[PDB]
């Protein structure tokens, strides 16, 4: 009852005092010395026109080529981005797919959605056709995100407020991470794959240790659902975007919000967030049909993509650093650089 | 291009061909989203039963006049629905089922209808309202043990409209209660939406077996109104 609420009440007050003590100079004042990146003009080089319904997810392959994408038409598509060739087309058992992932080895693709099942498909088989290697066990809510740790380990986030770590070989939940309050909407892996962050509908993000399965840290500051999350390339910070039309850059070590990216002229929610190769450019897709490119340090709109006719749903920068691919509800994927 | 590049382009073209064929085949049929609280008979609206894709969300398939309807019921979770609903912003219609027999939860159903109607993503989707279990409503109003005025004071000052047409020769009090109950929902619907999407109330009971015909007719009306919107008659 209230006996333990007081114990938790003082703990919340104390940690806030630690955060205020830790902060002396804001990030903006520190970075005021440097010169701005300047206007960033980015052009469309390819347009992928095979999807017959709105697209919810895409994931770049590790070879800076062969991206994968998922839409409500009940189809996964593996594209050769250089030539716009359709390498693979995978039928889905359930057309309600909300996420898709590409194995870093390039041998598997994972997709899940309203069916509560994270399917893993094998790309490289002797038979020559893509087959369902494993339908993973059940969540108690829809799947919002999934990412491959390796060819045998996957990490999923669900609408049952819980993330999970699965072994593909056994097909069982190796670890089940503790509860959020609301839906878990986003998920990002650290570069070393030792930690990972999750964003929830409770306007909070949580940093988790994969090996021990216990929430290491918790970050707050948003005002609505957190829709997207992404580590900094060096793994010491991460940015989130929420329905309150704002992005936040938090730092893991300082355990405190570092920067906020918002503009009075922007009011729609943010659907996707990703960084550039050096982390200076923060790319965010919005609900008003266009993406924005912010200077991650000086925090100003360095550019606009502005090429989609509908809601921008998914957004991803290639590992090599050449290009950024955005997929929208107009059933189109566009590659920019 | 080399020989391998040409063969890859050919394979991509074949993939495109299959994609378009599947797309037109899928575009042929109609898709509905079924909503309503428990203890409302939302699974009994259409007599035919199915267990299509029972994992996760629930699928039903029924054919009327040689046109196929796929009804999706996201019944796995009893929690907030505000997130996955945006995946359904392209269905033909939202079939909202309300059990009008019980007056205790009726305000909750009205609030749910208000939340659905004024949703940001469903601002262009028509709602087909099914007032289920009208026989229990008639029995309750005829018994007189429980009164609407305990929960709705305005029912004291409400009177049946001159356009009321009680067809089966029912009691006037039953018709008065039914029309007030439907009036609450149509008042919620009319306060916003400005004709972009409209509600189609209906009355039904558990033993009723003609709900498929009503769904088909109102879907035809929705398609007709979108067509007239395309040619800019509206």
């Amino acid at each position: 009852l209230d006996q333990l609420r007081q114990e938790a009440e003082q703990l919340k007050n104390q940690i806030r005092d630690a955060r205020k003590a830790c902060a002396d100079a804001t990030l903006s004042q520190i970075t005021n010395n440097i010169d701005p990146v300047g206007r960033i003009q980015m052009r469309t080089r390819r347009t992928l026109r095979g999807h017959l319904a709105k697209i919810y997810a895409m994931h770049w392959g590790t070879d800076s080529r062969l991206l994968v994408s998922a839409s409500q038409d009940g189809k996964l598509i593996i594209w050769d981005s250089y030539t716009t060739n359709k390498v693979h087309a995978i039928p889905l058992r359930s057309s309600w797919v909300m996420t898709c992932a590409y194995a870093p080895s390039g041998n598997y693709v994972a997709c899940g959605g309203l069916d509560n099942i994270c399917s893993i498909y094998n790309l490289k088989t002797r038979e020559g056709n893509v087959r369902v290697s494993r339908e993973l066990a059940g969540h108690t809510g829809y799947l919002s995100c999934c990412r491959f740790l390796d060819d045998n380990q996957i990490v999923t986030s669900s609408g049952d407020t819980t993330c999970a770590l699965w072994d593909i070989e056994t097909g069982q939940q190796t670890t089940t991470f503790t509860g959020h309050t609301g839906d878990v909407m986003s998920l990002s892996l650290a570069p070393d794959t030792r930690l990972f962050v999750s964003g929830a509908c409770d306007a909070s993000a949580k940093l988790w240790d994969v090996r021990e399965g216990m929430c290491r840290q918790t970050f707050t500051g948003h005002e609505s659902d957190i829709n997207a999350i992404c580590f900094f390339p060096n793994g010491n910070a991460f940015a989130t975007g929420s329905d309150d039309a704002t992005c936040r850059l938090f730092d893991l070590r300082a355990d405190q919000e570092l920067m906020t990216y918002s503009h009075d002229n922007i009011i729609c929610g943010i659907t996707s967030v990703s960084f550039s190769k050096s982390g200076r450019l923060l790319l965010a897709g919005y609900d008003d049909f266009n993406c924005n490119v912010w200077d991650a340090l000086k925090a100003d709109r360095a550019g606009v993509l502005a090429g989609h006719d509908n809601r921008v749903s998914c957004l991803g920068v290639t590992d090599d650093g050449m290009a950024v691919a955005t997929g929208s509800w107009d059933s189109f994927l566009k590659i920019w650089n | 291009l080399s020989a391998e590049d040409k063969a890859a382009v050919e394979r991509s073209k074949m993939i495109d061909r299959n994609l378009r064929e599947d797309g037109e085949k899928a575009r042929r049929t109609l898709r509905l989203l079924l909503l309503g609280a428990d203890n409302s008979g939302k699974s009994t609206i259409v007599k035919q039963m199915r267990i299509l894709h029972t994992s996760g969300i629930f699928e039903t398939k029924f054919q009327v006049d040689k046109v196929n309807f796929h009804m999706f019921d996201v019944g796995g979770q009893r929690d907030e629905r505000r997130k996955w609903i945006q995946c359904f912003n392209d269905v033909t219609a939202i079939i909202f089922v309300v059990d009008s027999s019980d007056y205790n939860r009726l305000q909750e159903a009205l609030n749910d209808f208000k939340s659905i109607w004024n949703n940001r993503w469903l601002r262009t989707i028509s709602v087909i309202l099914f007032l289920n279990k009208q026989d229990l409503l008639a029995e309750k109003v005829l018994a007189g043990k429980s009164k609407i005025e305990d929960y709705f004071p305005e029912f004291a000052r409400y009177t049946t409209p001159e356009d009321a047409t009680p067809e089966p020769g029912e009691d006037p009090r039953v018709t008065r209660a039914k029309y007030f109950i439907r009036k609450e929902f149509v008042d919620i619907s009319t306060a916003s939406g400005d004709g972009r999407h409209i509600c189609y109330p209906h009355f039904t009971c558990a033993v009723d077996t003609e709900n498929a015909r009503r769904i088909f007719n109102d879907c035809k009306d929705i398609i007709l109104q979108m067509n007239l919107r395309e040619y800019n008659l509206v």
Partner: single-chain antibody
Amino acid sequence: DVQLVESGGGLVQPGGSRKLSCSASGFAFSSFGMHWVRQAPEKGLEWVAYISSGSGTIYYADTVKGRFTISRDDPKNTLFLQMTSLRSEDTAMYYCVRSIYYYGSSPFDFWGQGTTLTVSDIVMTQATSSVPVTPGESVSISCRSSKSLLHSNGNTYLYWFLQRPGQSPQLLIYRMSNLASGVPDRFSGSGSGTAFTLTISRLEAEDVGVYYCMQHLEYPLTFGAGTKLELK
């Protein structure tokens, strides 16, 4: 359990007609282009014909152009070769080869058993036709092309095939330096855009056989003379 069994070979009179069939099982046949490849009884491999996936593209060799027809039946998973005006040079083994083409595919991955038949361009040069060798030591086999095989996209198309005695050929390197699936890692391929070398680090008893290098830059497809490795 990929399997391709062909039939139809037999004794025929010169100028006759014949039909060769090949049933495919264990794989998605309709998604694979298919090849007919000739091996003369005492000479090396020679490409004959190629049917594409979906029958969109058909390619023939000059020596059999017009009088040979290649056809495919997906529902029965079957391949047909109709041969007319048979000659003495058309007596061969007639292997059937699988193939698939996308960004990272490995064409010519699987080969059929072949059926002996008897009757009543870029040049591939192999410097050596035989190399005596002892097990346990490194070996290198080089071949050369008239025209550089390196396309503008950065891919150079040379394939390495090992045919053990009394066996159908198998693929080893499906590009410049791309090891095929199921091939032990001791094999490797290297070289420039015109001269290409296959390198084997350690030799066992199963490595004895003929080695062919093939080009795939453009049609027709031409094989090498073949380097024979025998244990010693």
